Design a protein around this ligand. Sequence first.
Ligand SMILES: Cc1cc2nc3c(=O)[nH]c(=O)nc-3n(C[C@H](O)[C@H](O)[C@H](O)COP(=O)(O)O)c2cc1C
Length: 362
Amino acid sequence: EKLFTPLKVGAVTAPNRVFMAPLTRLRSIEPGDIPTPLMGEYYRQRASAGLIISEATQISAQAKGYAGAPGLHSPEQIAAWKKITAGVHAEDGRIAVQLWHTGRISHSSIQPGGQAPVSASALNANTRTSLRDENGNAIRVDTTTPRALELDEIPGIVNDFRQAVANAREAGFDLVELHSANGYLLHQFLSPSSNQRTDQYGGSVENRARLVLEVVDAVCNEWSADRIGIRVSPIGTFQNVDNGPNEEADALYLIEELAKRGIAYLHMSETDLAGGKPYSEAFRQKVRERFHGVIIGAGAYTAEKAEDLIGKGLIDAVAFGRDYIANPDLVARLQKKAELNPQRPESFYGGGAEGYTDYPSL
Ligand SMILES: Cc1cc2nc3c(=O)[nH]c(=O)nc-3n(C[C@H](O)[C@H](O)[C@H](O)COP(=O)(O)O)c2cc1C
C-alpha cells in the first residue's frame, strides 16, 4: 500500500497519495464568487487527503463559466480563501488551488458585460454549463458561442494567470494547479478541433501549446516552479473537445515542454465521466519519460487501480473525485478498507450542506 505513503509535491510533502480531485461543487457566494465557511468546513473535513486540489477557481472574472464557482482575483476571494486554507492547515492539511479560465464553456450571462465568452476560435462548445436560477439553484444551460481572442488580448490572459498565482500565494495555498484540461480555455487552445487560428497561437502543435506554456512560464516566474502543477486531458474527448488526429504526439510535445519548466506536477484527467478508451501503459510510459515531477492520475479510479498504477511506477498519486465527495475521511476508509458512504449525485452541484458536509466520517 504505497497509497498511504508520503510524496514530495513541489514545495510540500503529501503524507499519502490519496488526493482530492478538483471538484466543482458550485456552492460559492454570488455576487463576488466567494468561498464560504461551509466550503471551508467541507475542505477541513477532507484535510486528511494527501493533497486537496480545490474546485476550479477563476483567475479573473472573465474566466467564469459556471454560476457558484469561486474566483481568486478579488480581495474578498483572497480573504475567504485564506480562512479556508487556514482551516485545512489547522488540520495539518495541504491545499492546491485549481485555476481556470472556462473559455467557451461559459455563458454570456455570467461574463463581464454579458458579452460572449472568449476562446481560441469562434466555435460553440455545443455543451451545457451550469448557471443558477433565481432561487440560487443549479440549472444546465447551453453554452454561448465564443469570440476568438485577438492576438493582443493574449498577454492579458497570461497576466491573469500570473496574478491569480500571486493571489494564491497570499491566500495561503500550498500549490496551484493550472486547468489546462477538460475542454476549458487552455484546452481549447490546445485542441485543433477547437482551435482554428492562423496566427502564432494556432495551426501547428507548437502554436496550440504556445498559450499554455506562456502561462506556465509566467506563473513559475511569479511564484516558483515548485508551486505550480497543471491539469491536462490530452488523450480522448472531453465535453466535445477532442485532442485532434495526432493526440498522442501533441500530448508528448506538450509534456516535454512542461518538463523544461521543472513544475511541481502533471495531473492527468484521463477520461470524461462518460468514459473513453483507457490510457495504454505505453502512453503512460511515454508521459513518465518526458515529465520529472509528480504525476497524478484521475478518472474513475478505484483504490485498487491507483495502487496498481502507483505500484507500477507510472503515476505518483491518484485524485479521487466522487469518492471524496462522499467520504471526507476517504483516506482512513481506503486505509481500513471500510465501506464507503453511498454517493448522492443529485447534490454534487449547488445546494448547501446536504450532500456536501453531511457525508459522515467513520
Ligand atoms: C461533481 C464533479 C465536479 C468536477 N469538477 C471539476 C473541476 O473543478 N475541475 C477539474 O479538473 N475536474 C472536475 N471534475 C472531474 C474530477 O476532477 C475528476 O477527474 C473525476 O471526478 C475523477 O473521477 P472519479 O469521480 O471517478 O474519481 C469534476 C467531476 C465531478 C464528478
